[PDB]
């Protein structure tokens, strides 16, 4: 729900890193839990224990991604003293991509993931700054 969205967004971007990391970790974990539920539904692998293991691995991976993104992005914003900069978000995305690569132990996916995640993060920051609407209300 939007409760986690508000919990993340309410914290100022350039301050108070640990709560930002906590919120991003929770959001990532919720996303991973939804992904695990869908994966269990569509592909029941063999049994209960392997299924709960797969849920654990997906949730921990997504939570680690969110934690690293939030921590790195907030630390970059704090040290650079320049809030409202998409570069900080891009760095966070790159950090998140690196963490994902480590989990999958692939140099290519880690590199590929880092570049793509960073770009996505930069775009989200630009949308926050400029007021871009993903889901626009009917205006006209």
């Amino acid at each position: 729900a939007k409760t986690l969205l508000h919990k993340y967004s309410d914290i100022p971007e350039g301050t108070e890193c640990h709560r930002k990391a906590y919120a991003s970790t929770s959001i990532g974990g919720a996303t991973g839990l939804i992904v695990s539920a869908y994966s269990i539904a569509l592909k029941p692998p063999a049994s209960f224990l392997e299924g709960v293991a797969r849920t654990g691995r997906y949730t921990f991976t997504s939570a680690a991604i969110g934690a690293i993104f939030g921590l790195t992005s907030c630390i970059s914003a704090q040290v650079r003293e320049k809030p409202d900069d998409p570069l900080n978000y891009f760095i966070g995305g790159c950090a998140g991509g690196l963490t994902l690569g480590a989990r999958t132990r692939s140099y290519g996916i880690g590199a590929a993931a880092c570049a793509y995640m960073g770009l996505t993060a930069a775009l989200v920051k630009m949308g926050q700054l400029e007021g871009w609407q993903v889901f626009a209300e009917p205006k006209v």
Partner: protein, 459 residues
């Protein structure tokens, strides 16, 4: 403008109601007459434009491209007459229909007072070219080539459409005259940066830009001769024409946003000219030479100075003619040797002296020998770049040197030396091929007498 559009449309029923052995003659004669009629668009004004109606308008940037488009069809028919001999009447009529439809779409694209109409026709040109490449190409790679030539284009062109409609939702119009008269500066914003990118990338991919040029060697190598001619001569210039039209709304953001594309073009011209030095295929070498010339045109358009625009127009026309001639020469060799490997058939001067003269003159125009219009455009762009920054001279001179090197390498490898002994099927050159070569080359040396016809609207 209908006095040119209607005859081009009438080319279709005339082609489909023709005798089985009169299609080439009738198509060639009436396409030549259409070219002659279109030649009267060259009487341009020093003032605004030739505004025929609400839908079509002519400009001294559009008129040379229109005349070259009309002139290219008879040459394409003459080049296609040979390798389509063993094919049924219905399929040859379909091939001529594809060529006529391509000409019609290009003609309507170059006038196209509306930006959405320009986009629609500029994307409608895609279908005939794809069918020609993937139907009448020889090798098995043609399908793959077609896919590239498709998706690259759309990958650039789909964002543009969005940008276009967005502009009309804010400005209220997409008419080029209203856009030019009511133009306003673009503020340095992320939204404006992405609008700039959406406006530019579609035309950048079809120049092509150096990083985005992968589709061109495949598409030009696997296409039949008419397809290669139309791809190199007219279809590459759509990006330049679109950029020249659309950069009027992108100021002053072009000053900052031009840097990555300027660096890409200035380094990629060197890269592609160097690639030409090590090439085992004639068509691939000619394609990479086209990439280098269009990189120079991209630099010219990005600098956006009067001399830049004049040089870019002149270079677009000259490159179209020269590349079409070079592809025709390569195809004349190929239809004899069936290999398309440059090192295989050697010493063709001793067996085909007049064709060797044609090769020499084509290499000379590709080499940008003065006072050809190739060098006129080259020098205007180079001077504009020098005014932009004095350090561009190193890259420009290096490109000139490498261009001369690979042009003369291509000439020496194929024409000089000793003939290959085991090749004994090199027949004397036909009157059709010599006529095709002359009809390519005389317009160039005759345009060098009246350069203002191809120097664009800023002359």
């Amino acid at each position: 403008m209908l006095k040119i559009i209607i005859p081009t449309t009438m080319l279709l029923p005339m082609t489909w109601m023709s005798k089985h052995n009169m299609i080439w003659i009738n198509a060639t004669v009436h396409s030549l007459l259409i070219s002659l009629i279109s030649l009267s668009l060259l009487n341009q004004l020093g003032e605004n434009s030739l505004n025929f109606s609400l839908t079509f308008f002519s400009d001294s940037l559009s008129a040379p491209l229109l005349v070259l488009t009309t002139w290219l069809l008879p040459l394409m028919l003459m080049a296609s007459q040979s390798h389509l001999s063993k094919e049924t009447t219905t399929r040859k009529k379909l091939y001529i229909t594809m060529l006529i439809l391509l000409q019609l779409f290009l003609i309507m694209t170059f006038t196209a007072t509306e930006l959405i109409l320009f986009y629609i026709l500029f994307e409608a040109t895609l279908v005939p070219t794809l069918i020609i490449i993937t139907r009448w190409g020889n090798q098995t790679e043609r399908l793959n080539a077609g896919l590239y030539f498709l998706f690259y284009t759309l990958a650039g062109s789909l964002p543009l459409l969005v940008a276009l409609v967005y502009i009309q939702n804010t400005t209220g119009s997409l008419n080029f005259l209203i856009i030019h008269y009511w133009s306003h500066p673009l503020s340095n914003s992320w939204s404006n940066i992405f609008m700039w990118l959406a406006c530019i990338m579609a035309f950048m991919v079809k120049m092509p830009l150096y990083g985005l040029h992968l589709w061109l060697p495949k598409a030009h190598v696997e296409a039949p001769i008419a397809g290669s001619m139309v791809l190199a001569a007219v279809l590459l210039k759509l990006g330049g024409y679109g950029m020249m039209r659309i950069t009027t709304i992108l100021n002053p953001l072009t000053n900052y946003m031009a840097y990555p594309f300027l660096m890409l073009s200035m380094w990629g011209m060197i890269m592609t000219s160097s690639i030409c030095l090590r090439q085992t295929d004639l068509k691939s070498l000619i394609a990479y030479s086209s990439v280098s010339h269009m990189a120079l045109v991209i630099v010219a358009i990005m600098i956006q100075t009067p001399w830049s625009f004049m040089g870019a127009t002149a270079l677009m026309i000259a490159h179209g003619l020269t590349s079409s001639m070079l592809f025709c020469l390569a195809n004349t060799n190929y239809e004899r040797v069936h290999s398309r490997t440059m090192i295989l058939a050697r010493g063709l001067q001793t067996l085909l002296p007049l064709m060797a003269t044609w090769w020499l003159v084509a290499s000379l125009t590709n080499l940008a020998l003065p006072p050809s219009i190739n060098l006129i455009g080259e020098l205007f762009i180079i001077t504009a770049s020098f005014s932009w920054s004095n350090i561009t001279i190193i890259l420009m001179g290096m490109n000139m040197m490498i261009t001369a090197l690979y042009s003369l390498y291509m000439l020496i490898t194929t024409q000089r030396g000793k003939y290959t002994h085991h090749i004994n099927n090199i027949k004397p050159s036909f009157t059709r091929e010599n006529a095709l070569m002359a009809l390519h080359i005389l317009p160039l040396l005759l345009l060098t007498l009246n350069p203002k016809m191809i120097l664009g609207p800023l002359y």
